[PDB]
């Protein structure tokens, strides 16, 4: 066996952003940025033809909700795209057709930023300001809704994924 190396640290905390107009200075409270580089996940009903082409774009980088606690607690258009550390969080998401696999630098670690006592701490979220370019989306597995399992023979890799570590 072999021990794992550390992660490349990018200088720009929103290097991964699909929409660079995001204003890092407006993020509240003070963000604690993720410095690890393991696979993250996103439940999304949008199909891979769209996500692989566009990446994950945020709803509103201009007038969206930049306060993380507010965005977590009350769903409102925001500059953030939510992801999770938890491969299995898709099992709790009703109706979301796909479990996307993400290999992206950075993101705001929600529980490190607003604590792990809030209602949704169990989501172990990483919030990406400005979203996530397609080159950081590994791929996707569709989810069977009846059993809350991945349809592993129907997973698809993103042709635009660019490994970086």
Numbering used by the authors: 36 to 200
What does the study report here?
S. scabies produces a 200-residue, 22-kDa protein that is a single-domain enzyme called Scabin. Scabin has been cloned, expressed, and purified, and shown to harbor dual enzymatic activities (GH and ADP-ribosyltransferase). Scabin targets DNA as a substrate for ADP-ribose modification; it also shows enzyme specificity towards genomic DNA from Solanum tuberosum tubers. Scabin shares nearly 40% sequence identity with the Pierisin family of mARTs.
Scabin has some common catalytic features with other members of the mART toxin family. This includes the key Arg (Arg77), which is important for NAD+ binding to the active site; the Ser-Thr-Thr motif (Ser117-Thr118-Thr119), which comprises the scaffold of the NAD+ binding site; and the hallmark catalytic Gln-X-Glu motif (Gln158-X-Glu160). Other residues that were studied included two NAD+-only interacting residues, such as Ser117 found in the STT(S) NAD+ binding motif and Glu160 in the Q-X-E motif. The S-T-S/T motif is known for its role in binding and positioning the NAD+ substrate in CT-like mART toxins. The rest of the Scabin variants showed either a WT-like crystal structure or similar CD spectra to the WT in solution. All the structures were of high quality, ranging from 1.5 to 1.75 Å.
